[PDB]
Scaffold this active site. Structure first.
Site, PDB file in Angstrom:
ATOM      1  N   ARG A 148      25.090  70.622  24.410  1.00 30.44           N
ATOM      2  CA  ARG A 148      25.691  69.605  23.568  1.00 30.44           C
ATOM      3  C   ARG A 148      24.936  68.291  23.630  1.00 30.44           C
ATOM      4  O   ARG A 148      25.455  67.298  24.122  1.00 30.44           O
ATOM      5  CB  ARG A 148      27.133  69.365  24.007  1.00 30.44           C
ATOM      6  CG  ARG A 148      27.987  70.628  23.949  1.00 30.44           C
ATOM      7  CD  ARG A 148      29.345  70.354  24.559  1.00 30.44           C
ATOM      8  NE  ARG A 148      29.215  70.050  25.975  1.00 30.44           N
ATOM      9  CZ  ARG A 148      28.884  70.943  26.909  1.00 30.44           C
ATOM     10  NH1 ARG A 148      28.644  72.208  26.570  1.00 30.44           N
ATOM     11  NH2 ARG A 148      28.827  70.567  28.189  1.00 30.44           N
ATOM     12  N   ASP A 206      27.519  74.899  33.093  1.00 29.73           N
ATOM     13  CA  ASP A 206      28.186  74.524  31.852  1.00 29.73           C
ATOM     14  C   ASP A 206      29.004  75.581  31.120  1.00 29.73           C
ATOM     15  O   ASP A 206      29.121  75.499  29.907  1.00 29.73           O
ATOM     16  CB  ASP A 206      27.150  73.964  30.865  1.00 29.73           C
ATOM     17  CG  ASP A 206      27.775  73.062  29.772  1.00 29.73           C
ATOM     18  OD1 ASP A 206      27.267  73.056  28.650  1.00 29.73           O
ATOM     19  OD2 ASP A 206      28.755  72.336  30.038  1.00 29.73           O
ATOM     20  N   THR A 207      29.552  76.570  31.811  1.00 26.98           N
ATOM     21  CA  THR A 207      30.342  77.613  31.133  1.00 26.98           C
ATOM     22  C   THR A 207      31.795  77.566  31.612  1.00 26.98           C
ATOM     23  O   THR A 207      32.677  77.133  30.888  1.00 26.98           O
ATOM     24  CB  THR A 207      29.785  79.013  31.442  1.00 26.98           C
ATOM     25  OG1 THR A 207      29.581  79.129  32.867  1.00 26.98           O
ATOM     26  CG2 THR A 207      28.456  79.244  30.736  1.00 26.98           C
ATOM     27  N   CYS A 233      26.923  89.074  29.623  1.00 23.81           N
ATOM     28  CA  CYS A 233      26.956  88.058  30.666  1.00 23.81           C
ATOM     29  C   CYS A 233      26.913  88.585  32.087  1.00 23.81           C
ATOM     30  O   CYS A 233      27.844  89.280  32.543  1.00 23.81           O
ATOM     31  CB  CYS A 233      28.195  87.186  30.517  1.00 23.81           C
ATOM     32  SG  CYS A 233      28.272  85.943  31.816  1.00 23.81           S
ATOM     33  N   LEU A 234      25.866  88.206  32.802  1.00 20.15           N
ATOM     34  CA  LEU A 234      25.709  88.646  34.170  1.00 20.15           C
ATOM     35  C   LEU A 234      26.696  87.918  35.064  1.00 20.15           C
ATOM     36  O   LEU A 234      27.068  88.423  36.127  1.00 20.15           O
ATOM     37  CB  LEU A 234      24.272  88.398  34.655  1.00 20.15           C
ATOM     38  CG  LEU A 234      23.258  89.357  34.021  1.00 20.15           C
ATOM     39  CD1 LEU A 234      21.954  89.245  34.704  1.00 20.15           C
ATOM     40  CD2 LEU A 234      23.764  90.807  34.142  1.00 20.15           C
ATOM     41  N   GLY A 235      27.142  86.742  34.622  1.00 17.05           N
ATOM     42  CA  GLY A 235      28.051  85.979  35.460  1.00 17.05           C
ATOM     43  C   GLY A 235      29.523  86.125  35.215  1.00 17.05           C
ATOM     44  O   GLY A 235      30.323  85.422  35.793  1.00 17.05           O
TER      45      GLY A 235
HETATM   46  C1  HEM Z   1      33.471  81.531  31.121  1.00 20.70           C
HETATM   47  C2  HEM Z   1      32.251  81.743  31.603  1.00 20.70           C
HETATM   48  C3  HEM Z   1      31.028  82.313  30.801  1.00 20.70           C
HETATM   49  C4  HEM Z   1      30.892  82.686  29.534  1.00 20.70           C
HETATM   50  C5  HEM Z   1      31.891  82.700  28.363  1.00 20.70           C
HETATM   51  C6  HEM Z   1      29.507  83.174  29.374  1.00 20.70           C
HETATM   52  C7  HEM Z   1      28.993  83.652  28.200  1.00 20.70           C
HETATM   53  C8  HEM Z   1      27.721  84.238  28.112  1.00 20.70           C
HETATM   54  C9  HEM Z   1      27.192  84.746  26.834  1.00 20.70           C
HETATM   55  C10 HEM Z   1      27.984  84.651  25.529  1.00 20.70           C
HETATM   56  C11 HEM Z   1      25.998  85.279  27.081  1.00 20.70           C
HETATM   57  C12 HEM Z   1      25.051  85.994  26.041  1.00 20.70           C
HETATM   58  C13 HEM Z   1      23.993  85.181  25.350  1.00 20.70           C
HETATM   59  C14 HEM Z   1      23.122  86.027  24.358  1.00 20.70           C
HETATM   60  O1  HEM Z   1      23.323  87.216  24.190  1.00 20.70           O
HETATM   61  O2  HEM Z   1      22.302  85.255  23.885  1.00 20.70           O
HETATM   62  C15 HEM Z   1      25.708  85.099  28.504  1.00 20.70           C
HETATM   63  C16 HEM Z   1      24.555  85.497  29.169  1.00 20.70           C
HETATM   64  C17 HEM Z   1      24.306  85.217  30.518  1.00 20.70           C
HETATM   65  N1  HEM Z   1      25.117  84.554  31.408  1.00 20.70           N
HETATM   66 FE1  HEM Z   1      27.133  84.099  31.104  1.00 20.70          FE
HETATM   67  N2  HEM Z   1      28.797  83.046  30.555  1.00 20.70           N
HETATM   68  C18 HEM Z   1      29.705  82.529  31.501  1.00 20.70           C
HETATM   69  C19 HEM Z   1      29.429  82.258  32.860  1.00 20.70           C
HETATM   70  C20 HEM Z   1      28.223  82.520  33.517  1.00 20.70           C
HETATM   71  C21 HEM Z   1      27.905  82.204  34.908  1.00 20.70           C
HETATM   72  C22 HEM Z   1      28.866  81.491  35.953  1.00 20.70           C
HETATM   73  C23 HEM Z   1      26.637  82.650  35.115  1.00 20.70           C
HETATM   74  C24 HEM Z   1      25.692  82.633  36.429  1.00 20.70           C
HETATM   75  C25 HEM Z   1      25.658  81.526  37.179  1.00 20.70           C
HETATM   76  C26 HEM Z   1      26.176  83.241  33.863  1.00 20.70           C
HETATM   77  C27 HEM Z   1      24.949  83.847  33.744  1.00 20.70           C
HETATM   78  C28 HEM Z   1      24.494  84.458  32.609  1.00 20.70           C
HETATM   79  C29 HEM Z   1      23.188  85.115  32.515  1.00 20.70           C
HETATM   80  C30 HEM Z   1      22.168  85.210  33.708  1.00 20.70           C
HETATM   81  C31 HEM Z   1      23.088  85.560  31.262  1.00 20.70           C
HETATM   82  C32 HEM Z   1      21.909  86.295  30.609  1.00 20.70           C
HETATM   83  C33 HEM Z   1      21.987  87.712  30.333  1.00 20.70           C
HETATM   84  C34 HEM Z   1      20.682  88.205  29.585  1.00 20.70           C
HETATM   85  O3  HEM Z   1      20.141  87.321  28.932  1.00 20.70           O
HETATM   86  O4  HEM Z   1      20.504  89.396  29.739  1.00 20.70           O
HETATM   87  N3  HEM Z   1      27.119  83.176  32.914  1.00 20.70           N
HETATM   88  N4  HEM Z   1      26.786  84.479  29.127  1.00 20.70           N
HETATM   89  C1  LIG Z   2      25.988  81.729  30.327  1.00 17.75           C
HETATM   90  C2  LIG Z   2      24.793  81.219  29.705  1.00 17.75           C
HETATM   91  C3  LIG Z   2      23.656  80.864  30.381  1.00 17.75           C
HETATM   92  C4  LIG Z   2      22.492  80.305  29.526  1.00 17.75           C
HETATM   93  C5  LIG Z   2      22.891  80.219  27.974  1.00 17.75           C
HETATM   94  C6  LIG Z   2      24.360  79.491  28.003  1.00 17.75           C
HETATM   95  C7  LIG Z   2      24.770  81.062  28.114  1.00 17.75           C
HETATM   96  C8  LIG Z   2      23.511  81.410  27.244  1.00 17.75           C
HETATM   97  C9  LIG Z   2      23.808  81.188  25.808  1.00 17.75           C
HETATM   98  C10 LIG Z   2      22.724  82.697  27.400  1.00 17.75           C
END
Ligand code: HEM
Ligand SMILES: CC1=CC[C@@H]2C[C@H]1C2(C)C
Ligand SMILES: [K+]
Length: 405
Positions: free
Chosen positions: A177, A242-243, A348-350
């Protein structure tokens, strides 16, 4: 203001939605994006805002586009274009097959296994913060809980000192943002500058934090480069600051305005996990996208190689074609359908860390501060972006109604 409509984009499909400042923001960020699901808006529209791009408004198209990485590459996943071009994070900026080898390494540092370890550390901090806040009868939810609870857990997982939070959190937010004081490219370069000496330091002398594990790990058998580790750690840092931070705020804002919803959770704590999902759907908050690899006809619309298409993970679950009464919160909702953690090879890995944080938050706050409202008169403001969020959430309550636990 608006970019000239490309020749190949149909005039009747134009709908100038602005993802960083939607028209309906005052009614609520999820509601502002929901405007794209109104009666006469099509499944796919073109907005001349932010340089011009497609927007898939329904979960059916959103899911399909995410599953079809051959046509919709993660190469340039960020909007505006300049930002998407500079977005080189690993593994989010890569498509299968090359993505997997790295996704596996990242899964190793934030996956379920790592989360079960962190379990007690997470409860302790949630209680710690809530009990310290309990007697005051008031708080600035975003800064007193939403931000330190998740960020401190991540800074702990990443083995990074808490004093670095202000700087890193500021960079992060400029990416999701932007307030305009910094471009995506500048924010990333500073994030890459921050990491480099830390990654070289932990490769020279291996610890057991997510960072060391990454800089010292392997991809499909071969050693990761310094640069590859940097691109992965920046992403990890981005996903950690930031999530969940913002999500906790949409959930608690809503709970402060839903006494009946709160009681149900007080009365039947066993439903907190289910409520966690319903809230994950209702207050979905991420929206990123893909870029067309070639010319491709999608649901009757001609897409050109190079066109960007925003695929709002947020919109699937708010889609009435997925959940009836989508804007309605129902913890007993039979089939909670959504794409809040994404969809396809980039899931989402997280998410396991996310659900854990959210659930402990619900359990421990309600168990100690069951009744609270929004500060009298407060005019809550949301901000829209790649990740939407809450500006501030003033909370008040009467200390006589709480309990140490
Ligand atoms: C309410 C919490 C969260 C939401 C709604 C969320 C949502 C997402 C979304 C929508 C994506 C897919 C982006 C795409 O396909 O371009 C993503 C990917 C990812 N997120 Fe989460 N996220 C959250 C929390 C976290 C946390 C706490 C972590 C780790 C500290 C994290 C790590 C990642 C990673 C490493 C990916 C990449 C997966 C890849 O690119 O294969 N996320 N997340
Ligand atoms: C959880 C996330 C980590 C990095 C960017 C913000 C989402 C993304 C859109 C993949
Ligand atoms: K790129």
């Amino acid at each position: 203001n608006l970019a000239p409509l490309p020749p190949h984009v149909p005039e009747h499909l134009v709908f100038d939605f602005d993802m960083y400042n939607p028209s309906n923001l005052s009614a609520g960020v999820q509601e502002a994006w929901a405007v794209l699901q109104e009666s006469n808006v099509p499944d796919l529209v073109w907005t001349r805002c932010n340089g011009g791009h497609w927007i898939a408004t329904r979960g059916q198209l959103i899911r399909e586009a995410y599953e079809d990485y051959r046509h919709f590459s993660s190469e340039c996943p960020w909007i505006p274009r300049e930002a998407g071009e500079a977005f080189d994070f690993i593994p989010t900026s890569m498509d299968p097959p090359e993505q997997r080898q790295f996704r596996a390494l990242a899964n190793q540092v934030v996956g379920m296994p790592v989360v079960d370890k962190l379990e007690n550390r997470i409860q302790e901090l949630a209680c710690s913060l809530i009990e310290s806040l309990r007697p005051q009868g008031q708080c600035n939810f975003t800064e007193d809980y939403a931000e330190p609870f998740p960020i401190r857990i991540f800074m702990l997982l990443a083995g990074l000192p808490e004093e670095d939070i202000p700087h890193l959190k500021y960079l992060t937010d400029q990416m999701t943002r932007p307030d305009g004081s910094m471009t995506f490219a500048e924010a990333k370069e500073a994030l890459y500058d921050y990491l480099i000496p830390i990654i070289e330091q932990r490769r020279q002398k291996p610890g057991t934090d997510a960072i060391s594990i990454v800089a010292n790990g392997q991809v499909n058998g071969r050693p990761i480069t310094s640069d590859e580790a940097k691109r992965m750690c920046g992403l990890l840092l981005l996903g950690g600051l930031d999530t969940v931070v913002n999500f906790l705020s949409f959930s608690m804002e809503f709970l402060a305005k839903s006494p009946e919803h709160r009681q149900e959770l007080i009365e039947r704590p066993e439903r907190i996990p289910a409520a966690c999902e319903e809230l994950l759907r209702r207050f979905s908050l991420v929206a990123d996208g893909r870029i067309l690899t070639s010319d491709y006809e999608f649901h009757g619309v001609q897409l050109k190689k190079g066109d960007q298409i925003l695929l709002p993970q947020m919109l699937s679950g708010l889609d009435e074609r997925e959940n009836a009464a989508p804007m309605h919160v129902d913890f007993s909702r039979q089939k909670v359908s959504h794409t809040t953690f994404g969809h396809g090879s980039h899931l989402c890995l997280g998410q396991h860390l996310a659900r854990r944080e959210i659930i402990v938050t619900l359990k421990e706050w309600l168990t100690r501060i069951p009744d609270f409202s929004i500060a009298p008169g407060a005019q809550i403001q949301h901000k829209s972006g790649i990740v939407s969020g809450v500006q501030a959430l003033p909370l008040v309550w009467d200390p006589a109604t709480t309990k140490a636990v």
